[PDB]
C-alpha cells in the first residue's frame with residue numbers, strides 16, 4: 001500500500017484543519033490514551049461531537065491516515081516555516097492536494113478574491129504540479145438554503161473556469177460537496193445532498209493515480225566515468241536514471257551530440273541484455289570517440305536527447321553565504337554527475353519562504369536564508385532537465401569554498 005504525502009490547502013477558516021482532523025479521526029491512528037480521553041470528555045458533556053472537538057484540540061496542540069489504496073501523511077501546507085525550502089531540498093514534497101473551498105456566502109468570494117488564498121493556492125498547486133487536485137466545497141450545510149446544489153455548481157463552474165484560465169488542466173480535478181465536522185461526503189455518503197451522485201472525498205483519494213515510473217520516462221544516463229579497455233573499446237559507466245537501455249540500442253551523448261551503438265552492458269561484472277532505472281552499469285559503445293565523452297555528460301536515446309542548457313531557471317534556497325550574492329556570482333553547481341561553474345545571470349525574484357509567492361521583483365542581491373527564482377548560465381555546455389520531468393537531473397547544489405551555498409530545483413531550461 002503506497003504512502004502519499006497530502007497537503008490540504010485553501011483560504012483561512014474555510015475548514016482545512018477541520019477536514020484534516022476529520023480524516024485523522026475517521027481513518028488515522030490517534031493513540032488510545034487520547035481517543036479514550038476524548039470519548040470520556042464526550043460522555044461527561046453528553047455530546048457525541050465532543051469527541052471530535054476534543055481530538056481537534058489535541059491535534060492542534062500536536063498525522064497519517066489510511067484509505068482503501070493508500071497511506072496518507074498530511075504534510076505542511078503553505079504559511080509555514082521552511083515551506084518553500086523543504087520542497088526545494090526534497091525534505092517534504094506533496095504527492096497530492098485537497099483544496100478546501102467554503103460554500104458559505106461571502107467566504108467563497110473572499111477566498112477567490114484577488115487577495116484570497118483559494119486563488120493563491122490554486123496557482124501554487126499549478127506550480128507544484130498537483131494536476132490531480134481534489135476540491136472539497138465545504139460548509140455545504142451553511143448555504144442558503146442548506147445543501148444548495150445551485151451554490152455548489154456555481155462554485156465548481158467558477159473555480160473550474162479560473163483553473164483553466166491559469167493553465168491548470170482540470171481533466172483530473174475532482175470536486176465534492178462536503179461538510180467537514182460530520183464527515184459528510186468525506187468518509188461516508190451524505191444523506192443531505194441527494195442531488196450529488198458522485199464519489200466521496202475518500203473515494204476520490206483512492207482514485208488518485210501514482211506519478212509516472214522512471215522506467216517509463218525517456219532514457220537518461222548521467223556519465224560517471226569513461227574508460228577505454230584494451231581490446232574492448234570505449235566504455236562509459238553511469239547509473240540509469242530513467243528509461244531502459246538495451247544491447248543494440250543507438251544512443252546519443254550530450255552535450256557532444258555524438259551517436260553510438262551499445263554493444264554490451266554489465267552490472268556487477270555480469271553482462272546483461274538491458275539496464276533499467278537504478279542499475280549502475282558499464283556499457284561498451286561503438287562509434288563515439290572517448291574524447292566526446294566525459295563525466296557529467298548524459299546519455300539518452302536519439303529521439304529524446306538529454307537537454308543541454310544555454311540558460312536555466314531555478315527555485316533556490318540560499319543555505320549558506322557569509323555576505324551577499326548578486327548577479328555575476330559564479331559558484332560550481334553539482335547536478336547529477338556534473339560539476340560545472342554556472343553564472344547567476346538574473347535574480348528574478350525573492351519568494352515568500354512560507355508561501356512560495358513572489359515577495360520582491362528583481363532583488364539587487366540575495367542573503368543567507370532567502371528563497372528565490374534565479375537564472376543561471378553554464379560556463380560550458382551542461383546537461384540539465386526540469387526537476388518535474390527528470391527529478392535526478394533537476395536538483396542541484398551550489399558549492400563554494402567546500403560549502404553548499406544553496407540548493408535548487410530547475411523550473412525552466414532554455415536549450
Ligand SMILES: Nc1nc2c(ncn2[C@@H]2O[C@H](COP(=O)(O)OP(=O)(O)O)[C@@H](O)[C@H]2O)c(=O)[nH]1
Pocket residue numbers: 010011012013014015016017018019138139140141142178179180181
Ligand atoms: N457548519 C460548519 N462549520 C464548519 C465546516 N467546516 C469548518 N467549519 C467551521 O469553520 C471554522 C473554520 O474551520 P477551520 O477548520 O478551523 O478552518 P481553517 O482556518 O481552514 O483550518 C471553525 O469554526 C469550524 O468548526 C462546515 O462544513 N460546516
